[PDB]
Amino acid sequence: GSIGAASTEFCFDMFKELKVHHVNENIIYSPLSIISILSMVFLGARENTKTQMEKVIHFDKITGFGESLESQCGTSVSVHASLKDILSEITKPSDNYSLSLASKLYAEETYPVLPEYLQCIKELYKGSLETVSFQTAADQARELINSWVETQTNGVIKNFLQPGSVDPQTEMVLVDAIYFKGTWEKAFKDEDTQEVPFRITEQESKPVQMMYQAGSFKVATVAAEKMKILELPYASGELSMFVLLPDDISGLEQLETTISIEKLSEWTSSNMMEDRKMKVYLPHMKIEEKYNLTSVLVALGMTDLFSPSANLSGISTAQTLKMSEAIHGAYVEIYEAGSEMATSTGVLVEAASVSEEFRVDHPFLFLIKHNPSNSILFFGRCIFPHH
Amino acid sequence: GSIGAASTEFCFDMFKELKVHHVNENIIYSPLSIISILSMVFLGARENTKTQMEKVIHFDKITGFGESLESQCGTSVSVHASLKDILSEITKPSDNYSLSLASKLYAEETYPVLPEYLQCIKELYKGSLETVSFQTAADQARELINSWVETQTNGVIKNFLQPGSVDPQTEMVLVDAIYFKGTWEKAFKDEDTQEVPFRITEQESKPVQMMYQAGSFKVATVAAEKMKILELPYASGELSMFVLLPDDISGLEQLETTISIEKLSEWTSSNMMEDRKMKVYLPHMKIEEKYNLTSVLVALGMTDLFSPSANLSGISTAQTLKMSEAIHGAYVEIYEAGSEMATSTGVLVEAASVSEEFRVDHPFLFLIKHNPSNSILFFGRCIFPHH
Amino acid sequence: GSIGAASTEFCFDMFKELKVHHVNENIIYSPLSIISILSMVFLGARENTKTQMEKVIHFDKITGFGESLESQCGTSVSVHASLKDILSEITKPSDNYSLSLASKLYAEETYPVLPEYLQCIKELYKGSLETVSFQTAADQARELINSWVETQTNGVIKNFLQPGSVDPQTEMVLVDAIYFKGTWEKAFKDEDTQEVPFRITEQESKPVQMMYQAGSFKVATVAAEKMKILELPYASGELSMFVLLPDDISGLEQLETTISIEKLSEWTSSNMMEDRKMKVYLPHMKIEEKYNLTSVLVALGMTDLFSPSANLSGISTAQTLKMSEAIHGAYVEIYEAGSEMATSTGVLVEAASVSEEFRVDHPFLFLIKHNPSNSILFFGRCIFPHH
């Protein structure tokens, strides 16, 4: 097996879990970056936490029978070689497009990470190590990690880590950043872009800037699922965009449920995809979304990793630590010349457990009273803060 | 035994009846202004209407078991004292915040008002009387009332009285307005505000600006209702904002039914509110709503006041007059530095109107035809006139 | 019968069929221009296509019993007379307004248009022919047609034909344009215009410039439908704008379902319309829309026309063709002095069969894959591609 297939299967399982909490909303995430950071953690996880992460990341399909566990480092020889060669394939330079993947881990000065684990991080993901004091200055370390992410994403992802996400309890933060900017194989003419209505539902429609071009494009029409897939290649044909468009507005739902790595392999088969003379209408796209994947990872069977029984002894034998916050951010912009996209996956670990915080992230009742008169000046039921 | 507690009780009694007409919708109103204006009308009511208003406003508990009619003015000595001292309390001048309560009554020049009732209006509510001709220039009187209310709300509540609210047959209007601009005790840093999802339902979410700060705040954890209340004091601690947030979204409904003056007094007890170091997240709020309380006040028990059996001898002894329209507007804006809030309550008497205008202030279809040929050149449906 | 009545009935049928896909959205379209272009095409059809077009255009009512087809050129004498006299009616010079109806057809050089059909176009629609090379320079043809449309609409409708509409397959294009600039019978004083809230819904409202004037106006009040109609005549009383408005906002929906040519005839009756002293508030309006009426016309009953079985023998004796696209655009601006309005309707005839586009106009699943690694760099669902 390959780790690209693990990324695919994880992508679609995670999408099935994610869509249930974001109905009628835009979704965007990077399977590769999430899988890469989660494998960084998977190397350190041992015993039941490691097997859980292995089944969730689908790295169990990668290892051949025999020579598992710390055959080379952290994981088996198969997963090790797969990780290394994928890092090499992604980081290969190209004059046509720009594509970068960087990994960095920040650690507390007091908390000592295993030198073997740091060396394996340098070997597999060639990620650097910085030592910052979280206990004394957590917010400054947050700002530094955020500036590193911002510069690694060419300023696309600013202020990745939310305020208050890290606190003096956090003792290590594993983060990565993927950035891609390319050009279309067949570009869209700037003059051909005009205003076109876009049907959000059958009832309502909103105007958007639609780019148009006519040419030979790979289209695969799946009638069993009532949907067509269009491939728009980029410069050099090493990266491609796939648009899975259901024939009708009502069909998309069905598609979301039936999509899978197996089904996708059938649909994107080189035989199934047909170069035809097509008129292509593609809208200007700008999608930015940031998620907290802790609940999603737990719902997928990664319960031990966030539990106080997490065995991450492969990272640091001194004391014990566990993961508490896994943040992900994704940005994608499609325009006429090409597209610019950028993602980041952050992970912070710590032994401590905050009992409570007071976060107003769902509807409530608010009350404003005059304390001397003990009278209610204002009372309200807030469902949406801003209409 | 105080008008503040009466305002609390009437607040929740009115919330329970108002919530049925605004499902899945923001709610906001000011109990202090509503009960001030209802006491304004209560002073004039006598016999059955006055007892109804006293029970619904909960001024019966304010008066001790002693003389309650004709004493001081209109009501008992106890209610008179409570009115006067709350009026003095919230109109207290403070350099820290701005809090203003204003009352004013408009009357037809042909309509006669008793001098003792006007002297009482100046005594307790310190409000002025303005004589305008409702029968001749009802629209002009409406615009004048809205301009006065706008100036008293510092431009926040503009065009308060809807068109057709006031009528030429209307005898006497009673209005009041509260404005409060204050700053937080512990402010929110502008840089700490970031975009965060807000979960309207379990499956739906929308992004909002969320201000964060870590500090010592007063929180009470009511486990019986599975809910937590947080207090944010303003400058000098004379006013504070209470956020009642259920632990889960679906619990909100339950809370809205179980909340009451007694339960609010239980939950916000000094022993229950504990000072704790909390991470606090609060969304940018801009909640603005206008209501017609006539139906709700009738449902609450004030049936005679809106019916032709309304006796208002203390208001106008020459001829009887009944109220038929009660409007109420409330606006609340929460930001990082502080908050700005403003409310108004409007009262109308003896209303009826027919035609007189063709005002196009709501969506409509339009037709443009060629009269010689009787052909439709243009047809359309206008919701937004300008884009 | 009269083609004005046909335009009215078709207008309301089309409104019924069109409003279903445009809820909470502005609508505007020209019945006269659409019915004129469709009558142009209707002269060229025979057999079932012609009868279908006649039913949808309601020209079957114009023809008196007897001498229905080929009596005049392509149609009955009654329909021919109606067409010619209507052209003369709305293209009548006047010093009070500017009203123009222009029609023009572009054809491929290799396409052999029947000369008698061209003579009919010149007789009944005053339509000139231009020969353009679609197969060798379709984009130049589109630019020329857009420039002609723009000049005929006095610069209101620019870039009328969207890219991709025309292509080397299109063989003929019929386009007409209506323009009308006029002044009110009773003008709006600029000083009387003030900023007034426009109530889109009951609780949310956006501010709009509102002109005011008082005087004698023709208003009809229909209580059975809970709505009033106001007639604002333009200069010289030859064109008038009708504004029908429900008393409550919620009534509007009902109105849109119950409006009809017969009900409109009832409501705009001379005895129903009454001159009365009225205050008139009317907002500034700038309403522009553009539609593709292929689906709407097919749903009304023009199935054979857009199918490969379309008989357009009256246009070309050889190489029979069929319509592919029917684009329409409308613009209206109402201000104090008067009004400026303009529409265009263009239909392009072609010959195709299988689906020839990959139009991305509804939410879709997109993914960006690294082909060497076969890993998904990005995956997402988008419902709206802009924020």
GROMACS .gro file of N, CA and C in nm, chain A residues 232-346:
model
  345
  232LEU      N    1  -0.948   1.958  -1.460
  232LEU     CA    2  -0.874   2.073  -1.511
  232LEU      C    3  -0.728   2.056  -1.472
  233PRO      N    4  -0.641   2.018  -1.564
  233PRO     CA    5  -0.499   2.001  -1.530
  233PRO      C    6  -0.431   2.135  -1.509
  234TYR      N    7  -0.324   2.132  -1.431
  234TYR     CA    8  -0.242   2.249  -1.407
  234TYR      C    9  -0.119   2.245  -1.499
  235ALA      N   10  -0.027   2.338  -1.479
  235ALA     CA   11   0.096   2.339  -1.555
  235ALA      C   12   0.178   2.214  -1.524
  236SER      N   13   0.223   2.146  -1.630
  236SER     CA   14   0.301   2.023  -1.632
  236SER      C   15   0.216   1.899  -1.605
  237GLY      N   16   0.088   1.914  -1.568
  237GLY     CA   17   0.003   1.799  -1.546
  237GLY      C   18   0.032   1.719  -1.422
  238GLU      N   19   0.116   1.770  -1.331
  238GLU     CA   20   0.145   1.700  -1.207
  238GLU      C   21   0.040   1.724  -1.099
  239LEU      N   22  -0.033   1.835  -1.106
  239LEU     CA   23  -0.146   1.860  -1.018
  239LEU      C   24  -0.269   1.887  -1.103
  240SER      N   25  -0.385   1.842  -1.055
  240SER     CA   26  -0.509   1.858  -1.128
  240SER      C   27  -0.620   1.898  -1.032
  241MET      N   28  -0.722   1.964  -1.085
  241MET     CA   29  -0.843   1.995  -1.012
  241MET      C   30  -0.955   1.906  -1.063
  242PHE      N   31  -1.033   1.850  -0.971
  242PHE     CA   32  -1.148   1.768  -1.007
  242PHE      C   33  -1.275   1.832  -0.954
  243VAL      N   34  -1.370   1.857  -1.043
  243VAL     CA   35  -1.502   1.907  -1.006
  243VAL      C   36  -1.601   1.793  -1.023
  244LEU      N   37  -1.659   1.749  -0.912
  244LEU     CA   38  -1.765   1.648  -0.911
  244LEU      C   39  -1.897   1.723  -0.904
  245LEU      N   40  -1.963   1.739  -1.019
  245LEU     CA   41  -2.086   1.816  -1.027
  245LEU      C   42  -2.203   1.721  -1.044
  246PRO      N   43  -2.297   1.718  -0.950
  246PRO     CA   44  -2.419   1.640  -0.971
  246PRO      C   45  -2.507   1.705  -1.077
  247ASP      N   46  -2.576   1.620  -1.154
  247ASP     CA   47  -2.657   1.669  -1.265
  247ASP      C   48  -2.765   1.764  -1.216
  248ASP      N   49  -2.822   1.737  -1.099
  248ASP     CA   50  -2.924   1.822  -1.040
  248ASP      C   51  -2.882   1.867  -0.901
  249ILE      N   52  -2.948   1.973  -0.853
  249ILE     CA   53  -2.912   2.031  -0.724
  249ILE      C   54  -2.942   1.934  -0.611
  250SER      N   55  -3.044   1.850  -0.625
  250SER     CA   56  -3.084   1.760  -0.518
  250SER      C   57  -2.992   1.639  -0.507
  251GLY      N   58  -2.912   1.610  -0.609
  251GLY     CA   59  -2.832   1.489  -0.608
  251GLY      C   60  -2.709   1.497  -0.521
  252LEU      N   61  -2.656   1.618  -0.500
  252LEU     CA   62  -2.530   1.635  -0.428
  252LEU      C   63  -2.530   1.559  -0.296
  253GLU      N   64  -2.638   1.571  -0.219
  253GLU     CA   65  -2.652   1.498  -0.093
  253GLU      C   66  -2.614   1.352  -0.111
  254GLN      N   67  -2.684   1.283  -0.202
  254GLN     CA   68  -2.654   1.143  -0.231
  254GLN      C   69  -2.505   1.123  -0.255
  255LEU      N   70  -2.447   1.205  -0.343
  255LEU     CA   71  -2.305   1.193  -0.375
  255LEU      C   72  -2.221   1.196  -0.248
  256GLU      N   73  -2.247   1.294  -0.160
  256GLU     CA   74  -2.169   1.308  -0.038
  256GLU      C   75  -2.166   1.178   0.041
  257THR      N   76  -2.276   1.104   0.042
  257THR     CA   77  -2.280   0.981   0.120
  257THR      C   78  -2.208   0.867   0.049
  258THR      N   79  -2.218   0.861  -0.084
  258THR     CA   80  -2.165   0.745  -0.156
  258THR      C   81  -2.021   0.762  -0.200
  259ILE      N   82  -1.964   0.882  -0.187
  259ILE     CA   83  -1.824   0.901  -0.223
  259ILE      C   84  -1.735   0.821  -0.129
  260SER      N   85  -1.627   0.767  -0.184
  260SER     CA   86  -1.534   0.682  -0.111
  260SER      C   87  -1.413   0.659  -0.200
  261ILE      N   88  -1.304   0.612  -0.138
  261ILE     CA   89  -1.180   0.591  -0.213
  261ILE      C   90  -1.201   0.487  -0.323
  262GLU      N   91  -1.277   0.382  -0.293
  262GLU     CA   92  -1.310   0.282  -0.394
  262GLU      C   93  -1.391   0.344  -0.508
  263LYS      N   94  -1.501   0.410  -0.473
  263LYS     CA   95  -1.586   0.475  -0.573
  263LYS      C   96  -1.508   0.580  -0.650
  264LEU      N   97  -1.423   0.657  -0.582
  264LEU     CA   98  -1.345   0.759  -0.651
  264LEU      C   99  -1.246   0.696  -0.748
  265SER      N  100  -1.184   0.585  -0.709
  265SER     CA  101  -1.094   0.514  -0.800
  265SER      C  102  -1.169   0.467  -0.924
  266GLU      N  103  -1.292   0.417  -0.906
  266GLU     CA  104  -1.371   0.380  -1.024
  266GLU      C  105  -1.403   0.502  -1.110
  267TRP      N  106  -1.437   0.614  -1.046
  267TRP     CA  107  -1.486   0.730  -1.120
  267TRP      C  108  -1.374   0.801  -1.195
  268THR      N  109  -1.257   0.813  -1.133
  268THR     CA  110  -1.144   0.882  -1.193
  268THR      C  111  -1.051   0.788  -1.269
  269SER      N  112  -1.102   0.673  -1.314
  269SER     CA  113  -1.021   0.582  -1.394
  269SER      C  114  -0.982   0.648  -1.526
  270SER      N  115  -0.859   0.622  -1.570
  270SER     CA  116  -0.811   0.680  -1.696
  270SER      C  117  -0.897   0.636  -1.813
  271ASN      N  118  -0.958   0.518  -1.805
  271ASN     CA  119  -1.054   0.476  -1.906
  271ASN      C  120  -1.185   0.554  -1.894
  272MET      N  121  -1.230   0.578  -1.771
  272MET     CA  122  -1.358   0.645  -1.750
  272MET      C  123  -1.354   0.791  -1.791
  273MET      N  124  -1.237   0.855  -1.782
  273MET     CA  125  -1.223   0.997  -1.812
  273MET      C  126  -1.199   1.015  -1.962
  274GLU      N  127  -1.281   1.099  -2.025
  274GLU     CA  128  -1.285   1.112  -2.170
  274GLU      C  129  -1.254   1.256  -2.209
  275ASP      N  130  -1.149   1.277  -2.288
  275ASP     CA  131  -1.128   1.408  -2.348
  275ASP      C  132  -1.240   1.436  -2.447
  276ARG      N  133  -1.317   1.541  -2.420
  276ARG     CA  134  -1.419   1.589  -2.512
  276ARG      C  135  -1.409   1.739  -2.528
  277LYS      N  136  -1.458   1.787  -2.643
  277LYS     CA  137  -1.476   1.930  -2.666
  277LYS      C  138  -1.587   1.979  -2.575
  278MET      N  139  -1.552   2.059  -2.475
  278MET     CA  140  -1.648   2.104  -2.376
  278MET      C  141  -1.638   2.255  -2.358
  279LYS      N  142  -1.753   2.317  -2.334
  279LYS     CA  143  -1.760   2.451  -2.279
  279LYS      C  144  -1.755   2.439  -2.127
  280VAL      N  145  -1.658   2.504  -2.065
  280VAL     CA  146  -1.635   2.495  -1.921
  280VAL      C  147  -1.665   2.631  -1.860
  281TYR      N  148  -1.758   2.633  -1.766
  281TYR     CA  149  -1.793   2.750  -1.687
  281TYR      C  150  -1.753   2.720  -1.543
  282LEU      N  151  -1.654   2.793  -1.492
  282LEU     CA  152  -1.605   2.772  -1.356
  282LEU      C  153  -1.608   2.905  -1.283
  283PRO      N  154  -1.665   2.911  -1.163
  283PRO     CA  155  -1.675   3.039  -1.093
  283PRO      C  156  -1.546   3.077  -1.023
  284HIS      N  157  -1.529   3.208  -1.003
  284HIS     CA  158  -1.428   3.256  -0.910
  284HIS      C  159  -1.452   3.194  -0.773
  285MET      N  160  -1.347   3.136  -0.715
  285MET     CA  161  -1.364   3.066  -0.588
  285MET      C  162  -1.268   3.123  -0.485
  286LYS      N  163  -1.318   3.144  -0.363
  286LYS     CA  164  -1.234   3.183  -0.250
  286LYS      C  165  -1.297   3.121  -0.125
  287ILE      N  166  -1.238   3.012  -0.078
  287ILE     CA  167  -1.292   2.933   0.031
  287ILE      C  168  -1.188   2.926   0.142
  288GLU      N  169  -1.223   2.977   0.260
  288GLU     CA  170  -1.136   2.976   0.377
  288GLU      C  171  -1.214   2.916   0.492
  289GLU      N  172  -1.165   2.806   0.548
  289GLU     CA  173  -1.234   2.745   0.662
  289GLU      C  174  -1.133   2.689   0.761
  290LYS      N  175  -1.164   2.705   0.890
  290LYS     CA  176  -1.081   2.655   0.998
  290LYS      C  177  -1.166   2.573   1.093
  291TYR      N  178  -1.119   2.453   1.126
  291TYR     CA  179  -1.191   2.358   1.209
  291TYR      C  180  -1.108   2.316   1.329
  292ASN      N  181  -1.178   2.269   1.432
  292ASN     CA  182  -1.119   2.202   1.547
  292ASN      C  183  -1.156   2.055   1.536
  293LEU      N  184  -1.058   1.971   1.503
  293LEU     CA  185  -1.083   1.832   1.466
  293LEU      C  186  -1.079   1.736   1.584
  294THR      N  187  -1.067   1.786   1.707
  294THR     CA  188  -1.061   1.697   1.822
  294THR      C  189  -1.184   1.607   1.829
  295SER      N  190  -1.303   1.667   1.821
  295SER     CA  191  -1.426   1.589   1.823
  295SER      C  192  -1.433   1.493   1.705
  296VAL      N  193  -1.386   1.537   1.588
  296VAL     CA  194  -1.392   1.453   1.469
  296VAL      C  195  -1.296   1.336   1.480
  297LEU      N  196  -1.174   1.361   1.530
  297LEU     CA  197  -1.079   1.252   1.548
  297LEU      C  198  -1.128   1.153   1.653
  298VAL      N  199  -1.188   1.203   1.761
  298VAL     CA  200  -1.243   1.114   1.863
  298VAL      C  201  -1.355   1.029   1.805
  299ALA      N  202  -1.445   1.091   1.729
  299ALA     CA  203  -1.556   1.019   1.668
  299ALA      C  204  -1.510   0.913   1.570
  300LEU      N  205  -1.387   0.923   1.520
  300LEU     CA  206  -1.333   0.824   1.427
  300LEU      C  207  -1.252   0.716   1.497
  301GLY      N  208  -1.256   0.711   1.630
  301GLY     CA  209  -1.187   0.607   1.704
  301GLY      C  210  -1.053   0.645   1.762
  302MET      N  211  -1.016   0.773   1.757
  302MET     CA  212  -0.893   0.820   1.819
  302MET      C  213  -0.917   0.866   1.962
  303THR      N  214  -0.996   0.791   2.039
  303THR     CA  215  -1.037   0.838   2.171
  303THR      C  216  -0.921   0.842   2.269
  304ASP      N  217  -0.834   0.740   2.265
  304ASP     CA  218  -0.726   0.731   2.363
  304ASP      C  219  -0.628   0.847   2.351
  305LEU      N  220  -0.609   0.900   2.230
  305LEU     CA  221  -0.507   1.002   2.209
  305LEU      C  222  -0.537   1.127   2.292
  306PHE      N  223  -0.665   1.164   2.300
  306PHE     CA  224  -0.709   1.278   2.379
  306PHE      C  225  -0.741   1.241   2.524
  307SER      N  226  -0.741   1.113   2.557
  307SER     CA  227  -0.772   1.067   2.691
  307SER      C  228  -0.650   1.079   2.782
  308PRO      N  229  -0.671   1.085   2.914
  308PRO     CA  230  -0.556   1.084   3.006
  308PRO      C  231  -0.476   0.954   3.002
  309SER      N  232  -0.526   0.850   2.935
  309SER     CA  233  -0.455   0.725   2.918
  309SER      C  234  -0.375   0.719   2.788
  310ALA      N  235  -0.345   0.834   2.729
  310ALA     CA  236  -0.270   0.837   2.604
  310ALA      C  237  -0.124   0.801   2.629
  311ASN      N  238  -0.073   0.705   2.553
  311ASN     CA  239   0.066   0.661   2.564
  311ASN      C  240   0.143   0.723   2.448
  312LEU      N  241   0.198   0.841   2.471
  312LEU     CA  242   0.288   0.907   2.377
  312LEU      C  243   0.432   0.901   2.426
  313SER      N  244   0.470   0.787   2.486
  313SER     CA  245   0.603   0.772   2.544
  313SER      C  246   0.712   0.778   2.438
  314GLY      N  247   0.680   0.747   2.312
  314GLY     CA  248   0.778   0.759   2.206
  314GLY      C  249   0.825   0.900   2.182
  315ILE      N  250   0.745   1.000   2.220
  315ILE     CA  251   0.787   1.139   2.206
  315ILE      C  252   0.878   1.179   2.321
  316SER      N  253   0.832   1.161   2.444
  316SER     CA  254   0.910   1.198   2.562
  316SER      C  255   0.887   1.094   2.671
  317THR      N  256   0.996   1.031   2.715
  317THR     CA  257   0.987   0.934   2.825
  317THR      C  258   0.974   1.004   2.959
  318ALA      N  259   1.029   1.124   2.972
  318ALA     CA  260   1.012   1.203   3.093
  318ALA      C  261   0.866   1.243   3.108
  319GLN      N  262   0.809   1.214   3.225
  319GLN     CA  263   0.669   1.243   3.256
  319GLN      C  264   0.577   1.177   3.155
  320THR      N  265   0.456   1.230   3.140
  320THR     CA  266   0.357   1.180   3.046
  320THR      C  267   0.281   1.299   2.989
  321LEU      N  268   0.240   1.288   2.863
  321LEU     CA  269   0.164   1.394   2.799
  321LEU      C  270   0.057   1.334   2.709
  322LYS      N  271  -0.037   1.419   2.669
  322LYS     CA  272  -0.147   1.378   2.583
  322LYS      C  273  -0.187   1.497   2.497
  323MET      N  274  -0.258   1.468   2.389
  323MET     CA  275  -0.305   1.570   2.296
  323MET      C  276  -0.439   1.626   2.341
  324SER      N  277  -0.455   1.757   2.326
  324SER     CA  278  -0.580   1.820   2.364
  324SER      C  279  -0.644   1.902   2.253
  325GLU      N  280  -0.566   1.960   2.163
  325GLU     CA  281  -0.622   2.046   2.060
  325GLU      C  282  -0.554   2.018   1.926
  326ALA      N  283  -0.637   1.991   1.825
  326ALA     CA  284  -0.595   1.969   1.688
  326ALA      C  285  -0.673   2.065   1.599
  327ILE      N  286  -0.603   2.165   1.544
  327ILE     CA  287  -0.664   2.271   1.465
  327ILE      C  288  -0.622   2.252   1.320
  328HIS      N  289  -0.712   2.284   1.227
  328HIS     CA  290  -0.681   2.274   1.085
  328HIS      C  291  -0.736   2.395   1.012
  329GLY      N  292  -0.657   2.448   0.919
  329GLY     CA  293  -0.701   2.560   0.838
  329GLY      C  294  -0.674   2.540   0.690
  330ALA      N  295  -0.769   2.576   0.604
  330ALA     CA  296  -0.755   2.555   0.461
  330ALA      C  297  -0.807   2.675   0.384
  331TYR      N  298  -0.733   2.713   0.280
  331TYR     CA  299  -0.766   2.824   0.193
  331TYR      C  300  -0.744   2.781   0.049
  332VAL      N  301  -0.838   2.817  -0.038
  332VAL     CA  302  -0.832   2.783  -0.180
  332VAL      C  303  -0.892   2.898  -0.260
  333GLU      N  304  -0.817   2.949  -0.357
  333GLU     CA  305  -0.865   3.055  -0.445
  333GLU      C  306  -0.844   3.014  -0.590
  334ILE      N  307  -0.954   3.008  -0.665
  334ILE     CA  308  -0.952   2.977  -0.808
  334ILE      C  309  -0.986   3.104  -0.885
  335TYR      N  310  -0.902   3.137  -0.982
  335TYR     CA  311  -0.919   3.254  -1.067
  335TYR      C  312  -0.886   3.214  -1.211
  336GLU      N  313  -0.878   3.313  -1.300
  336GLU     CA  314  -0.861   3.283  -1.442
  336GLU      C  315  -0.722   3.230  -1.473
  337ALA      N  316  -0.618   3.292  -1.417
  337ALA     CA  317  -0.482   3.253  -1.451
  337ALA      C  318  -0.449   3.114  -1.397
  338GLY      N  319  -0.492   3.084  -1.275
  338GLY     CA  320  -0.466   2.955  -1.214
  338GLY      C  321  -0.537   2.943  -1.081
  339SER      N  322  -0.464   2.904  -0.977
  339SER     CA  323  -0.521   2.899  -0.843
  339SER      C  324  -0.410   2.903  -0.740
  340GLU      N  325  -0.443   2.957  -0.622
  340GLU     CA  326  -0.350   2.965  -0.510
  340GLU      C  327  -0.417   2.905  -0.387
  341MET      N  328  -0.351   2.807  -0.326
  341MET     CA  329  -0.410   2.732  -0.216
  341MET      C  330  -0.305   2.708  -0.108
  342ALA      N  331  -0.352   2.691   0.015
  342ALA     CA  332  -0.262   2.684   0.129
  342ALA      C  333  -0.335   2.626   0.249
  343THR      N  334  -0.268   2.536   0.321
  343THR     CA  335  -0.329   2.468   0.434
  343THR      C  336  -0.228   2.457   0.547
  344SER      N  337  -0.281   2.432   0.667
  344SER     CA  338  -0.197   2.414   0.785
  344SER      C  339  -0.271   2.326   0.884
  345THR      N  340  -0.197   2.238   0.951
  345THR     CA  341  -0.252   2.151   1.054
  345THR      C  342  -0.166   2.162   1.179
  346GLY      N  343  -0.224   2.212   1.288
  346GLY     CA  344  -0.154   2.230   1.413
  346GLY      C  345  -0.206   2.134   1.519
   0.00000   0.00000   0.00000
